[PDB]
Amino acid sequence: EREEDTVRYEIVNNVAWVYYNRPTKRNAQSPKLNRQMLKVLTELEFRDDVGVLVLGGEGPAWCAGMDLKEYFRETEAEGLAGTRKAQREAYTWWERLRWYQKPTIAMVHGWCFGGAYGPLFACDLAFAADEAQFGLSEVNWGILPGGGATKVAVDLMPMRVAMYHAMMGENLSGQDAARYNLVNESMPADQLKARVKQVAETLIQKNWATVKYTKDAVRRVKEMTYDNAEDYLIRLQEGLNWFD
Amino acid sequence: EREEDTVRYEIVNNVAWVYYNRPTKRNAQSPKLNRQMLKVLTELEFRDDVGVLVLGGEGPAWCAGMDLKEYFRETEAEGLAGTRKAQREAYTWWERLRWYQKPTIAMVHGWCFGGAYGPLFACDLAFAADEAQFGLSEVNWGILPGGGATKVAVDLMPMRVAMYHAMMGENLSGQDAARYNLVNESMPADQLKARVKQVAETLIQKNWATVKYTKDAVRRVKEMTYDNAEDYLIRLQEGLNWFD
Amino acid sequence: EREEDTVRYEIVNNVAWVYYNRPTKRNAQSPKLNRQMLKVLTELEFRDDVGVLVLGGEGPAWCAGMDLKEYFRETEAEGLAGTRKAQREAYTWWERLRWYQKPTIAMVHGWCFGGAYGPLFACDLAFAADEAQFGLSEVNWGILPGGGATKVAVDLMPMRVAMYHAMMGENLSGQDAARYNLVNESMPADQLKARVKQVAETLIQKNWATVKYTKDAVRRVKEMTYDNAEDYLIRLQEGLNWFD
Amino acid sequence: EREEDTVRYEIVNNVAWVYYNRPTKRNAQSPKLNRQMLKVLTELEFRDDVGVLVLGGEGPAWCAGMDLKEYFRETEAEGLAGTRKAQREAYTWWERLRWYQKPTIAMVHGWCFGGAYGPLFACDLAFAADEAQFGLSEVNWGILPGGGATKVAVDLMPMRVAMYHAMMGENLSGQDAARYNLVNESMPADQLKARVKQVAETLIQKNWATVKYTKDAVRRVKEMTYDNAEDYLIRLQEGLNWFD
Amino acid sequence: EREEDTVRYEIVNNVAWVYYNRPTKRNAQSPKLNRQMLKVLTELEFRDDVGVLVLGGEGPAWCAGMDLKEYFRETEAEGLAGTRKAQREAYTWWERLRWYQKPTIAMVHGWCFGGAYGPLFACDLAFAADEAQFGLSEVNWGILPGGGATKVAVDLMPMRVAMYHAMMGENLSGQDAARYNLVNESMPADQLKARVKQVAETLIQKNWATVKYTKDAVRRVKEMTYDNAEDYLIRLQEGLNWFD
Amino acid sequence: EREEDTVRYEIVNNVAWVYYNRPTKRNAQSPKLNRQMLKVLTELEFRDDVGVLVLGGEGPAWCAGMDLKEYFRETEAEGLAGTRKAQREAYTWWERLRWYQKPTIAMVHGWCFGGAYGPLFACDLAFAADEAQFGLSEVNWGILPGGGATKVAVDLMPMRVAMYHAMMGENLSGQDAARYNLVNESMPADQLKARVKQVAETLIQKNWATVKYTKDAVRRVKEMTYDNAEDYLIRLQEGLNWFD
Ligand SMILES: CC(C)(COP(=O)(O)OP(=O)(O)OC[C@H]1O[C@@H](n2cnc3c(N)ncnc32)[C@H](O)[C@@H]1OP(=O)(O)O)[C@@H](O)C(=O)NCCC(=O)NCCS
Ligand SMILES: CC(C)(COP(=O)(O)OP(=O)(O)OC[C@H]1O[C@@H](n2cnc3c(N)ncnc32)[C@H](O)[C@@H]1OP(=O)(O)O)[C@@H](O)C(=O)NCCC(=O)NCCS
Numbered sequence A, B, C, D, E, F: 001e002r003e004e005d006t007v008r009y010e011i012v013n014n015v016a017w018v019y020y021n022r023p024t025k026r027n028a029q030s031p032k033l034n035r036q037m038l039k040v041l042t043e044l045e046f047r048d049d050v051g052v053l054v055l056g057g058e059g060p061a062w063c064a065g066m067d068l069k070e071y072f073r074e075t076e077a078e079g080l081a082g083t084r085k086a087q088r089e090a091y092t093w094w095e096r097l098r099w100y101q102k103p104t105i106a107m108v109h110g111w112c113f114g115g116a117y118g119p120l121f122a123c124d125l126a127f128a129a130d131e132a133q134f135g136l137s138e139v140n141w142g143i144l145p146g147g148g149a150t151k152v153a154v155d156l157m158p159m160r161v162a163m164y165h166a167m168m169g170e171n172l173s174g175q176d177a178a179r180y181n182l183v184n185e186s187m188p189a190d191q192l193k194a195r196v197k198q199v200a201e202t203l204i205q206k207n208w209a210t211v212k213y214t215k216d217a218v219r220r221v222k223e224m225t226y227d228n229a230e231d232y233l234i235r236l237q238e239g240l241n242w243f244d
C-alpha cells in the first residue's frame, strides 16, 4: 500500500540493516519497493556513520523476485513506456548497490528467486541459512531468467551448474548455494545474524576507502585481460593515495 | 565400414537417444561418423516429436576421441585439402550440437578422451557413470589438446584443474569430473540411464522455446560484460515473445 | 646483504629447484631478490638439462610478499623513478616465469602473502603443505591487493571467494587453497617434496615442446571467445609441428 | 535561476527540437540543466507524436562543457556525496539519450567543448556548421578528458587524431570534424537547420521500430566479435518481429 | 531454373574469376545460388593452379542482396526448419570465403545491397567502379541490416558513417565507398577489370603461404588486444615456418 | 661496431631529440641498437628537465626495420635462446616507449619499413615528410608482418587499407600515410623539424602529469567498452589529483 513502508532500515554501530518490507508478499520487488529501495540506498550511501550495509528480508522470504501483479502485469497495461519506467527503477537500484561506496552483505535467511539474483549479485558478500532456497523459476513460468539473473548464475557458479540451474528451474539449498559459490557460506538460521554481524564489525575496523577500492577492483578486473588488470591496479592505488 | 551404420538413434516419448555406433573402435570420431552425425543431428533438430537429444555410446567407451587412422593418418595423406575437409566435418557437427534447437544431454557411461571434449561441451548438460574416465591424452601422443578441447577444459573447470588436466594427461573419474564441473553429476552406471531419462522428461514438460532461449543465453552471456549481458537478456525476451 | 645470495638453485635430474633465499626476512621480494630471480630464471630457461622448474622457499615462509623496507619505503624515497624501477624489476620476473619455456611448479610449504600471488599465478601448477597459509593482507595495511594479486584471486578462485579473500584479509589453509583452486593439491608438509618431485618426473617424460605449447594454450584461450580459441589451437599445432 | 528554464523544446511535424537553454553561460551543463534535460528527455521519449529528437543550443554555443562553477566547484564544496550526486545526474541523461527510443540528431552550430562530447556521442547522427568549433580543452585546464569524452574521441576518430585532439587541446572546425568523422556533415551555418529538418523528416517516414533496432544494433555490434555479432542480429530481428 | 547455372567461373593465369550468375534477378542470393557458391568455392580452394579468387557479377548488379522470393518468402513458408536451412546455406559460404586459403578480391561494377555485404566483407580486397552503388536498403523494407551487414558497416566504415548508412538506407557511390573504406579503390567502370587483373597478378608472384597467414592475421588481430596480438603474430610465423 | 654509438640524443629547450644512429645501415634495429635504445630511454624518462621525447633517424632512413644480419641470421644461429633474447630486447624498448612517462613524437623524414612500425605506434604523435615512405615489405621477403606491425596497421588505418598494405607490400607516401592516419601530418621535408619543435614546445607548456594521464587514457580506452571506459576515466582523474 504505502511506498515508504516497502523498505525499513536501522543503523546500529555503523552497520545499516536494510530489509525488504513486504513480508506478506514474500518481499516481491514492486515498483514502489524499487523506488523506495533507491531512496533508502541513496540516503545511506555517504553517511560517515554507515561503514557496511546488510540487505535482509522480513518474513519467510529474502526476496521472491519481481511482483507478478505490480511489476509485470500492471506496467505492461501502460504499454512500452510503462514497462521501460518499471525496468529502469529495478536496474537502477541494483546498480546503485553493485557499485555502493560501502561494503554490502546479503543475509539470505529464506527464499531467493528470479529477480532477487540482481540484488544478490550486487551485494559484495552473501551468507545464507541452510534453510534458504535459491531458484531461477523463470523457465517454470515460460520466461528467460531476466534482470541479469542468467549472467549472475554464469558469473558466480561453474558453467554446468549455471546451465542446470537456469534450464531445470530446481532450487539449491543454502549448503548447495555455498558449494557452488552463489554465496560465501551457509549455516543454521539461528547463527546467521551473529555471523553477518561479525563480518560487518571486521570490515568497519579496516580503512573504509581501502575496502571500497578493493571490492571495486575485484568486480572490475573480472572484465579485463591479466596484462590490462596489472596496470589498472597501479592506477587504482594512485586514486586511493588521494582519497586516503 | 558403412557410413550410415556409424551412428544409431531411437526416438521414444519425445527423447532422441543418439549413440556413437563404432563400439569395437571405442566410438572413435572418423570422417564417416562425423558426416553421419551431422546428417542425424540435422534431420532430428526441428521434428515436433523431439524435445530433448541424449548423446550416448555403444560398448565400453562414450567416445575415445578422433580416429587416429581415418581422421589423422588417412586425411593427411591427401595433403592440406584432405586435413581441412576432415577438420570441417568434425567442427561442423560439434557446432550444430552446441547451438541445437533442442536441449542436449551427454550420457557418459565410459571413456571420454581428447576430441570427445568438443561434443561433451556442445551438450548443455552432462551425466557420468562413476566408472567413466575423462582425459586429455593428446600431450601423451605429443600434440596440443585440439578440436577446442583446451578451451573446453578452461570454460568448464577451474584454471589450475584445467592446466593439470591438459599438461599431465591423467584421467578424472566420473566423481572427479562432477567435483570439477566437467559434468553436472556422477552416479553408479546402473542408475545413469534412469537419471538421464528423468532429466529429459522434466525438460519436455517445460515450454520448449523458453528452454532454447535460456540455454543459448547461458552460453552467450559468458562472452559479454555484465552491463552488455543485462541489455542482451531484454532483447532475447522480445525474441521469445515472438516465438511463443 | 649480497644480491647473488637472495636466490639459490640446484639442478638435479632435469629439475631446477629454485628457492627464495631470504629465510630470516620470510623471503620478502626486495629489489635485490627481484633482480637476482630474473638473472637465475633467464640463465636456466633454455638449458637442455632443465625440463621443469620448481619455485620453493627457505625457512618458514614460501614468500611473505614485497619487502616493506627495501621494495616500498626505500624506493619511494627515490621518488617516481625509484618506484617505477622497483615495480619493473618485480613485474618483469613474474612475467618471465608466467611465460617460461619450461613447465613451472610452486611448492608452497609455508606463508604465501600479497605480492607472492604474482609468482604463485606465474607457476603453471601449485602444490601446498596443509600447514601453508595464503593471504591477501594488503587490506590489513591499508592498500589494494597490487602486483596483479586481485586478478590472481579472480582468475583462480570463484568470484565470492575472491571477494571475501581480498576484502577480509583472512588466511586460507593449504586444504582451503586446494578446495578453492588457488593451488592444485594440499598434503601434509612431509609428503610435499615427494609429490612435487613425482609431478616433475612425469612432465620430463613427455615431449618438452608439446608441454610448452599446451601450458601456453591453457593460459591464452582464457582470454578468447570459444570460436576464436578453436582457430587459435589449429594455428598453435602448426607452430608445434615446426618445433617438433 | 530557474531549473525549468535551462532546457526548452518545440514539437514540429513530429520532430522534438530540444535546446540547451543557458545561452549567456554558453549552455554549460549545470546540475540544474542535467536534472531538467533528464526530465524533458524522459517525457518526450514514448510520445506517439515524436518520431525524432534534435539536440540544439541557444546563443553562440552548442554546449561549452560542464558548468565550472555549478557542476565542479559548488559540488566539491559538498564533498564526495555532492560530486557523486552531480556526476550521476550528468551520466544518467547522456545514457538516456545514447539509448533513446527515438532517433537522435545533434545540430552543432557553435562551440562544442569537453563534457559536451557525451551528448555529442549520445546523438546517433550529428550535423555541424562550418564555423562550429570542437575541442577537448580539458588538458589546458590540467584535467583528463572526462565524462567519457576521451572514449568518444577514440570511438569516433582515428587513433592518431584522437591522440592529438586530447593531448594538444586544439579545436577542430566543422569541416575537420566531418573529415575525421566526429560528425556526419559540415555545412555553412545558414544551411544547417534545413538539412537537419530534411534528415529528421526522412527518418519519420521509416518504420520507427526498425530505426530503433537498427541504431541500437550499430552501437552494440562495435563491442562484439564478428561471429557474435552475426548471431546477435538474428536475435534482434526476432525481437523486432514481435515489436512490429 | 538450374542450381548448377547460378554461379560460373573461368581460370585465367591461375586466377579464378567467379561470378554471381543470375543477371536478370540482379544476382540475388537464392538458396540455389548459396548451395552452388559453396560447391564452387570448396572445389577451387586447394587447387595448386589457383592463386587468387575474384568475385564478380553478370548484368548491372554485383549482388542486389538476398532473393526476397526464394530466400525469405519460400523458406518462411516451410517454417523455422526452412528458415534455418536457408540461413545456414548463406552464412556457410560467406564464412568459407572470409577464411579462404587463397587471397580474395571483390570486383564491384554495379549494385551491392543488403545481404551482399557479407560476401563484400568476406573478400580481403574490393575494387569498385565509380558508377557502382552500395546501400543497406533493409531499413526501407522495415528489417534490421542482417546477414552480419550492420557489423560489416561498423567494421569497415567510421561509426558516424555506418550509423547514417544503416539508418537512412541511402546509397554510397564507388567514390564515397572508397572514401569511407568500404572498398580499397574506385575507378571508372572501363578500368576496373584491368586494375583487378593487375592486383591478382601481383599476389600470385608472392609466397602463397605468406599471403594466406598475412590476410588471416589482419582479420584476427582486430579482435585482440595489442599485447595478445604481439604474441599471436610470433605463434603465426612459427606456423608459416612449418608451411613453407 | 660500438653499442654506445647506435643511438645519439641532444636535450634542447627540455625536449630530448633521440636518433637512430646507424645511418649507413638505414638505422636497422640490431640487438646492439635495441639494448642501447632501452638504456637511453630509461635514462631520460624521469629527468625533470625532459618534457617531451622526439624519435628521429640519421641518413635517408627513419628506420628500415630489423637488421636482417644482426637481429635475424646471427641470433637464429644461436638457436631458440638467441632468438628469444633478441626478440625480448626489441619488444622491451618498444613497450618502454609506448608507455613513456613523457609525451613522444616520431619525426619520420625517410624510410619507415617493417619492424619500424612498433616504434612508430609507440610514439603518441607522428609527423612525416611528404618524401617519407612507409611499407610492410615483410610479405615480399616471405614472412608475416611481425613485431606487432600487422596490429599497428589495423589499429591505425582502416581495415581495407591495412589489408592492402600488409598483403601487397607496397609503400605509402607521407601524404597517403597522413590520409590513412598512420601519422598525424605530412609536410615537405624542409618544414618537418620546425613543426615538430612547435608541437614539442606546446606540450612542455602543459601540466606534464595531465599530458601523461591523457595519452595513457587514449591508448587504454581503445581496449574497453564505453561503459567500462566512463568509470576508468573517473578512476584516472583520482590518480592525477594525487600526482598534481
Ligand atoms: C516464494 C514462495 C515459495 C513462498 O511461498 P508461500 O510462503 O507458501 O507463499 P504463498 O505463495 O502461499 O503466498 C504469499 C503471498 O505472496 C504473493 N507472492 C509470492 N511470490 C510473489 C511474487 N513473485 N510476485 C507477487 N506476489 C507474490 C502470493 O500471491 C501471496 O499473496 P496473497 O496471499 O495476498 O495472494 C512462493 O510465493 C513463490 O513461489 N513465489 C514466486 C517466485 C517467483 O516465481 N519469482 C519470479 C519473479 S522474478
Ligand atoms: C579408449 C581405450 C582406453 C579403450 O581401451 P580398450 O577397451 O582396451 O581398447 P583397445 O585399445 O584394446 O582396442 C579397441 C579398438 O579400438 C581402436 N581404438 C581405440 N581408440 C582409438 C582411437 N582414438 N582412434 C582409433 N582407433 C582407436 C583400437 O585400435 C582397437 O582396434 P582393433 O582392436 O581393431 O585394432 C583405448 O583404446 C585408448 O586409449 N584409446 C585412445 C584414446 C586417445 O588417445 N584419443 C585421442 C584422440 S583425439
Ligand SMILES: CC(C)(COP(=O)(O)OP(=O)(O)OC[C@H]1O[C@@H](n2cnc3c(N)ncnc32)[C@H](O)[C@@H]1OP(=O)(O)O)[C@@H](O)C(=O)NCCC(=O)NCCS
Pocket (backbone or CB within 6 Å): C024, C025, C026, C028, C060, C061, C064, C065, C066, C067, C068, C069, C111, C113, C114, C115, C116, C137, C138, C141
Ligand atoms: C610472514 C609472517 C607471518 C611470518 O611471521 P614470523 O615467522 O613470526 O616472522 P616475524 O614477522 O616475527 O619476523 C621475520 C622477519 O622478517 C621480516 N619480514 C616479514 N615479512 C616481511 C615483509 N613482507 N617485508 C619485509 N620484512 C618482512 C620481519 O620484519 C622480521 O625481520 P627482523 O626480525 O630482522 O626485524 C610475518 O612476518 C608477516 O606477517 N609478514 C608480512 C606479510 C605481508 O604483509 N605481506 C605484504 C607484502 S605484498
Ligand SMILES: CC(C)(COP(=O)(O)OP(=O)(O)OC[C@H]1O[C@@H](n2cnc3c(N)ncnc32)[C@H](O)[C@@H]1OP(=O)(O)O)[C@@H](O)C(=O)NCCC(=O)NCCS
Pocket (backbone or CB within 6 Å): D024, D025, D026, D028, D060, D064, D065, D066, D067, D068, D069, D111, D113, D114, D115, D116, D137, D138, D141
Ligand atoms: C567559448 C569560449 C572559448 C570563449 O567564448 P566567448 O564568447 O568569449 O565567451 P566567454 O568566455 O566570454 O563567456 C564567459 C561567460 O560564460 C560562462 N561560461 C562559459 N563557459 C563556461 C563553463 N564551461 N562553465 C561555466 N560558465 C561558463 C561564464 O560563467 C561567463 O559568464 P559571464 O558572462 O557572467 O562572465 C570560452 O567561454 C570557453 O573556453 N569556455 C569553456 C570551455 C571549456 O573548457 N569546456 C570544457 C568543460 S567540460
Ligand SMILES: CC(C)(COP(=O)(O)OP(=O)(O)OC[C@H]1O[C@@H](n2cnc3c(N)ncnc32)[C@H](O)[C@@H]1OP(=O)(O)O)[C@@H](O)C(=O)NCCC(=O)NCCS
Pocket (backbone or CB within 6 Å): E024, E025, E026, E028, E060, E064, E065, E066, E067, E068, E069, E111, E113, E114, E115, E116, E137, E138, E141
Ligand atoms: C537494383 C534496384 C535498385 C533497381 O534496379 P533495376 O534495374 O530497376 O531492377 P528491377 O527492380 O527492375 O529488377 C526487378 C527484377 O529483379 C529481381 N530482383 C531484383 N532484386 C531482387 C531481390 N533482392 N530479390 C529477388 N528478386 C530480385 C526481381 O525478381 C525482378 O524480376 P523481374 O524482371 O521478373 O520483375 C532494385 O532491383 C532493388 O532495389 N532491388 C532490391 C535491393 C535490396 O533491397 N537488397 C537487399 C536485400 S538483402
Ligand SMILES: CC(C)(COP(=O)(O)OP(=O)(O)OC[C@H]1O[C@@H](n2cnc3c(N)ncnc32)[C@H](O)[C@@H]1OP(=O)(O)O)[C@@H](O)C(=O)NCCC(=O)NCCS
Pocket (backbone or CB within 6 Å): F024, F025, F026, F028, F060, F064, F065, F066, F067, F068, F069, F111, F113, F114, F115, F116, F137, F138, F141
Ligand atoms: C631502403 C631500401 C628500400 C633501399 O634504399 P637504398 O638507399 O637503396 O639502400 P641499400 O639497399 O643500398 O642499403 C643497403 C645497405 O643498408 C643495409 N641495410 C638496409 N636495410 C637493412 C636491413 N633491414 N637489415 C640490415 N641491413 C640493412 C645493408 O646492410 C647494406 O649495407 P651496405 O651499404 O654495406 O651494402 C632498402 O635498403 C630496403 O628495402 N631495406 C630493407 C627494408 C625492409 O625490408 N625492412 C623490414 C625489415 S623488419
Ligand SMILES: COc1cc(C=O)ccc1O
Pocket (backbone or CB within 6 Å): A065, A066, A087, A090, A114, A115, A138, A143, A144, A145, A146, A147, A148, A149, B237
Ligand atoms: C522479463 O523482465 C524481467 C525479468 C526478471 C527476472 O527474471 C527481472 C526483471 C525483469 O524486468
Ligand SMILES: COc1cc(C=O)ccc1O
Pocket (backbone or CB within 6 Å): B065, B066, B087, B090, B114, B115, B138, B143, B144, B145, B146, B147, B148, B149, C237
Ligand atoms: C590436431 O587436430 C585435432 C585434434 C583434436 C583433439 O585433440 C581434435 C580434432 C583435431 O582436428
Ligand SMILES: COc1cc(C=O)ccc1O
Pocket (backbone or CB within 6 Å): A237, C065, C066, C087, C090, C114, C115, C138, C143, C144, C145, C146, C147, C148, C149
Ligand atoms: C602497491 O604496489 C604493489 C603492491 C603489491 C602487492 O600487493 C605488489 C607489488 C607492488 O608494486
Ligand SMILES: COc1cc(C=O)ccc1O
Pocket (backbone or CB within 6 Å): D066, D087, D090, D114, D115, D138, D143, D144, D145, D146, D147, D148, D149, F237
Ligand atoms: C572530471 O569530471 C568530469 C569531467 C568532464 C569533462 O572533462 C565531464 C564530467 C565530469 O564529471
Ligand SMILES: COc1cc(C=O)ccc1O
Pocket (backbone or CB within 6 Å): D237, E066, E087, E090, E114, E115, E138, E143, E144, E145, E146, E147, E148, E149
Ligand atoms: C533477416 O535475415 C537476413 C537478412 C539479411 C540482410 O538484410 C541477410 C540474411 C538474412 O538471413
Ligand SMILES: COc1cc(C=O)ccc1O
Pocket (backbone or CB within 6 Å): E237, F066, F087, F090, F114, F115, F138, F143, F144, F145, F146, F147, F148, F149
Ligand atoms: C619474425 O620476427 C620479427 C619480425 C618483425 C617484423 O616483421 C619484427 C620483429 C620480429 O622479431
